[PDB]
Every structure is written in C-alpha cells, then in structure tokens.
C-alpha cells in the first residue's frame, strides 16, 4: 500500500519538475518572439521607406531617360495545476502572436520581392543612360 503511495509521490514530483521546465521554455520563447516581433517591425519600417524611395527613383530615372504522502500528493497536484494553467495560456498566446507574425512575414516577403524587382528594373534603365 505504502509502496504505491511512495511511487505516486515520486510520480507527482517528476510531474511538477517537468511542468516547471516546460514553463521556463515557454517564457523564453514568448519573450524571444517579442524581440523578433520588434525586429520585424524595424524591417517593416525600412521596407515602407524603400517603397517611397523607389517611387522617387522611378520618376528620376524616367526623366533621366527623357533627357504525509497523501498530503504531499495533494500539494504537488496543486502546484502542478498552477503550472499547467500557465502552460495553457502560454500556448494560446503563442499561437496568437505567431499567427499575426505569419501574416506579417507573408507581407514582408511580397514587399521584398516587389522592391527587388523594381530595383532591378531601374538599374537596367540606368545602364542604358
């Protein structure tokens, strides 16, 4: 009887340990996704600026060309349940933030490709002047 209770105590101990490890990883990942979100914001600003500059370049180039064991099990389940909560909201918020970043990255890709094409066009036009 006692042996099973001991094994269950050990089970809940490892259970809580793994839950806490998972939570550490999740918090680092959310903070790190926020940092990468800020970086992508800088990218987005630079791309917007280059769009404006490429409009200017287009017009200039056009003109240029023109020109005790039971209690412990209970307490371990308490602490486990707390951490598992933190794991659930962390998973949900991660999905949210990352979905927004996926749409943002799609727009970033398309804008980068368009800017690259425009720059190649204007370079080719300048080559002939």
């Amino acid at each position: 009887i006692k042996f099973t209770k001991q094994s269950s105590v050990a089970s809940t101990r490892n259970t809580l340990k793994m839950a806490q490890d998972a939570e550490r990883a999740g918090m680092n990942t959310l903070g790190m996704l926020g940092h990468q979100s800020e970086q992508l914001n800088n990218v987005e600003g630079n791309l917007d600026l280059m769009k404006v500059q490429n409009k200017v370049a287009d017009e200039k180039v056009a003109e240029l060309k023109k020109l005790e064991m039971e209690l412990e099990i209970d307490r371990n389940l308490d602490q486990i349940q707390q951490v598992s909560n933190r794991l659930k909201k962390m998973a949900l918020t991660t999905g949210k933030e990352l979905d927004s970043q996926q749409k943002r990255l799609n727009n970033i890709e398309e804008s980068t490709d368009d800017l690259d094409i425009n720059l190649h066009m204007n370079t080719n036009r300048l080559a002939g002047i």
Binding site: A25, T29, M32, V43, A57, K60, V61, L64, L115
Partner: protein, 45 residues
Amino acid sequence: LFNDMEELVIEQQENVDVIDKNVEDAQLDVEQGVGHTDKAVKSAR
C-alpha cells in the same frame, strides 16, 4: 513540445537577425542611389 518550440525559435533568431541587417543595409544604399539620380538629373537639365 515546449522544449522543441524554444529550440526552433532560437534557430529562427538567426534568420531574423540577417533579414533585419540586410533590409537596413538595402535601405541605406537605396537612399544613396536616389541621391545620385537626383544629382544626375540636376546635371542633365
């Protein structure tokens, strides 16, 4: 799963760094390039 996610995001950090740097570099060259086309137009007129 949480561990694997952290590792993948750590890996992806490398990409984000390079992208930020390249786009920043590109923007500065484009700005310089436009400056050149402005001066070129000033002369051609």
